[PDB]
């Protein structure tokens, strides 16, 4: 039935290496600060556009700031202006900068930087002081050696015999931070339709120095992604009836194994 799988770590590493070209090699979600579905939800609910983000119709009827009638509160002779309060600030702190924040979503704050040292040269030992690491500028009531403390004969470090690092240690460490599904080692099987390859491509920022048409392509792709994510509702409780199983149970149909191109020509002729 081809429903579930469980691979081995060397297989998973090799598949990751082959797929490298389709993956962004990101080890954190700090990249998506104010660029994830929650920030987009907040911007939509407030009818504001992130510079690189989509742009929807006002969820509510927008308050025209030419409508309020200059109370004592919003007097402009009292306001000290230093920097224009950009839309990013209002998405970042929806409750401190917005009046009437309705259907607004709070955004995950910082996450600690993942300081991972990608291993460029396989031949190197797994544990190795990479040049990227800043040097440690070197420089205690110890007992006296004359003391009679002696270890028994049996005693030695817990895993002396076992080697520190093996051939497939760096690979496993890298897989620990590989993106999904390359961080797994077992699971289920999906549909080629259900696997999108460039969703993570247009979820990222647009590369610098790109033409306006591709920039707008990015923005509209994000718009429809957000719309689907927001409008999603859970499916309903069906009874699991199968059309082709019913057909097979009938007597007007029979099964056979054919070449796909032959079936395609067959279907073209039948449709005509």
């Amino acid at each position: 039935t081809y429903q579930r799988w469980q691979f081995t770590l060397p297989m998973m590493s090799t598949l990751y290496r082959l797929a490298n070209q389709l993956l962004t090699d990101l080890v954190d979600d700090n990249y998506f600060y104010l660029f994830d579905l929650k920030a987009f939800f907040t911007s939509k609910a407030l009818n504001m556009a992130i510079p690189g983000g989509p742009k929807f119709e006002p969820l509510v009827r927008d308050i025209n700031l030419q409508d309020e009638d200059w109370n004592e509160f919003n007097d402009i002779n009292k306001i000290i202006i230093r920097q224009p309060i950009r839309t990013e600030y209002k998405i970042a702190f929806p409750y401190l900068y917005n009046n009437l924040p309705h259907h607004v979503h709070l955004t995950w704050y910082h996450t600690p930087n993942v300081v991972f040292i990608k291993t460029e040269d396989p031949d190197l030992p797994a544990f190795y002081f990479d040049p990227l690491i800043n040097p440690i500028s070197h420089r205690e009531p110890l007992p006296d050696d004359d003391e009679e403390f002696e270890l028994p004969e049996f005693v030695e470090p817990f895993l002396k015999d076992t080697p520190l690092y093996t051939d497939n240690t760096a690979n496993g460490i890298a897989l620990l931070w590989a993106p999904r599904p390359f961080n797994l080692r077992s699971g289920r099987t999906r549909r080629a339709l259900d696997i999108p390859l460039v969703k993570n491509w247009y979820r990222e920022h647009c590369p610098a120095g790109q033409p306006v048409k591709v920039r707008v392509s990015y923005q509209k792709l994000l718009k429809y992604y957000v719309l689907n994510a927001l409008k999603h509702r859970p499916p309903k409780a069906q009874k699991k009836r199968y059309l082709f199983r019913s057909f097979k149970a009938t007597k007007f149909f029979q099964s056979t194994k054919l070449d796909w191109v032959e079936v395609g020509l067959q279907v073209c002729r039948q449709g005509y």
Binding site: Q21, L22, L23, T24, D25, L26, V27, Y31, A49, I50, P51, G52, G53, P54, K55, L65, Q66, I76, I79, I81, P84, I85, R86, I117, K118, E120, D121, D123, L124, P131, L132, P135, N200, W201, E204, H205, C206, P207, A208, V212, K213, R215, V216, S217, Q219, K220
Partner: protein, 107 residues
């Protein structure tokens, strides 16, 4: 012009046909802040790459800061090992090119 547009932003905040191409007026990200126009694309420690884009082009167009940092910090033996690895990669690149040469530069 930038200061005038900034003040304009402050003032404005406070006071049938089939088209197969999105209009250029729909574009967002048309900002006035340099911090938001040029946004310092990520340099993943000089060892991470954007998906899809050519690796050689990415290396060529990267800031080179991490290359300078590596040449500064690397020990002599580390530099020798890295140079040997780069030589191996260059040999692989040249062999791949020689195999996948165009017919205008073959025998």
């Amino acid at each position: 012009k930038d200061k005038s547009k900034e003040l304009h932003a402050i003032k404005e905040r406070y006071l049938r046909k089939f088209v197969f191409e999105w209009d250029a007026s729909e574009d967002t990200s048309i900002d006035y802040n340099p911090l938001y126009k040029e946004r310092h694309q990520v340099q993943l420690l000089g060892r991470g790459f954007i998906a899809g884009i050519d690796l050689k082009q990415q290396k060529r167009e990267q800031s080179r800061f991490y290359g300078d940092l590596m040449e500064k910090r690397r020990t002599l033996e580390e530099k020798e090992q890295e140079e040997a690895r780069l030589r191996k990669l260059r040999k692989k690149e040249a062999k791949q090119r020689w195999d996948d040469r165009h017919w205008s530069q073959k025998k």
